[PDB]
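Notebook B, p. 112. Complex prediction, attempt 2.
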Amino acid sequence: SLRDIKTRINATKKTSQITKAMEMVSTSKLNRAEQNAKSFVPYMEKIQEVVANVALGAGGASHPMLVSRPVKKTGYLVITSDRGLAGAYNSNVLRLVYQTIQKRHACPDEYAIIVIGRVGLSFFRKRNMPVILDITRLPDQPSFADIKEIARKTVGLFADGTFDELYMYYNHYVSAIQQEVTERKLLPLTDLAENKQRTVYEFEPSQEECLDVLLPQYAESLIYGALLDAKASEHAARMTAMKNATDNANELIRTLTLSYNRARQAAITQEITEIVAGANAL
Amino acid sequence: KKVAGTLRLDLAAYRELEAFAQFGSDLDKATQAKLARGARTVEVLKQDLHQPIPVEKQVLIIYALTRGFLDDIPVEDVRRFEKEFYLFLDQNGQHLLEHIRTTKDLPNEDDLNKAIEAFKKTFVVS
Amino acid sequence: ALAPEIVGEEHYQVARKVQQTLQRYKELQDIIAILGMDELSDEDKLVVHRARRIQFFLSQNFHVAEQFTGQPGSYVPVKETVRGFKEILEGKYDHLPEDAFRLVGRIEEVVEKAKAMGV
Amino acid sequence: ALAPEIVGEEHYQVARKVQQTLQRYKELQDIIAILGMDELSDEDKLVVHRARRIQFFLSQNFHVAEQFTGQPGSYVPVKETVRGFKEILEGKYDHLPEDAFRLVGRIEEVVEKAKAMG
């Protein structure tokens, strides 16, 4: 009936307005987060190339950050949203890590999960797999000091020897339209190669202690880089998901308006037919 | 007049907030609170068939609702909170009802809160 | 005739609770058309889940149908009906495939169909 | 009256391949809009390249447009229409840019326009 379709049109128009507004604000956070990441990208390029060339000289490959340890337990960092409507951003990465761990070994003792994000923590809790560490509701502009606490804890776990290998499962920003699930080993560190050019540390201190300062600092900076791309790609994923959802809302409103117009015009033409039938009958 | 006037404001404010914001899963804290108060409000206003409730025990349930004594209790259990409370209110609190019967007046707030807090000692949550 | 006096409390609670789940499913059908199934959670996920199965299990093979279709018909007692819909609402049989619940008499027949489909 | 016999099974088969190409383009640009061009493989990529050639070559140059824009006009018999589109459907002529096809009579007129343009 006519007054049935109008309520559906009105409610959909309100949801369409909510989705458009959230598209605007996600666009603003996407552009800022990409600029912020590009601000820390020269820091990553500079640090990576100095830490590698310094790390080669008299730093033994048996060093705890570089040498393998026979694998008993592995840590899984998983980076996830704190809020919904993000399309399939969380589901594609939770599902990828869930299948990866279960189909490599579902044994409860070997895996150890570390999750950044409420919907990730919610899925893992229903599954019951343990979460050694957690943090949530990070500011949309994340700063190094915030995630230094968790970064220093997780690397503290690897450095003290409680983990033998470490992984990260972040979505990655390739385009505004489309983004990819990705996986990287965090430690042990094996980008080592010949220097070509050599810059020397101080001669008096044993370089292995200096490595214990500088290489954990790099591993942390690698976590932070991954988090920056994760938050930027989240704001991209929400922007595209909210944009597509607005398109679906608009199409539906069109179809409903066509049916509402047809129903009203049918009612008015019936009314006019009654007026004619009265006018000749009298 | 005192309790029903504020109840109209509460339910109008949540009618609009729920009409749009319920579809999204998570909202602002202050809105999750107002959504909780509206859901409890509609559940506490459900009633049975051919069982009129005297005005004396209506004002005491609406007062318990608006002043926010029902936050601890779950939404499903409320139709039992009412059931077990009206029995308690005929086992204890007869003077409150007597003042309301002829005066048309809300009893002293110290004694009304003492009554509701004692019942909340007796009632067992699922 | 629906009235706790006329049908009894066990039968009444079930008539209303089933109507309550199907009415919520109509509300969810619109929002899933915009956002998708992936966006619903908790009480909205399980309503679509149980409202599909209930909507199919209200379908039955009539004894007069054997001329339109090759099938044998059934007669179902009221007790098996009220237990059946209670069991679907509890969710004891949630694992069975939604195909199985179509044109069937009792929950035992649904288990037999689902066994032949590899449960 | 597009009956397969009446047009001729060669005219019929060419016409159906043109219509199939434009219908696939109609859906395929929605897939490009929601996912992307770089989300599509090579053959689909060739279909969008061909569909752009088909849509522009379907445009024509005529006498009424002498008042509106001053271009002289063209005339085409049906055997020339089918011949030219058959050669475009094979796709060897795809080296000419999409800009060249904008308003033309015969594929040979496209040849004259393209080389001169640069």
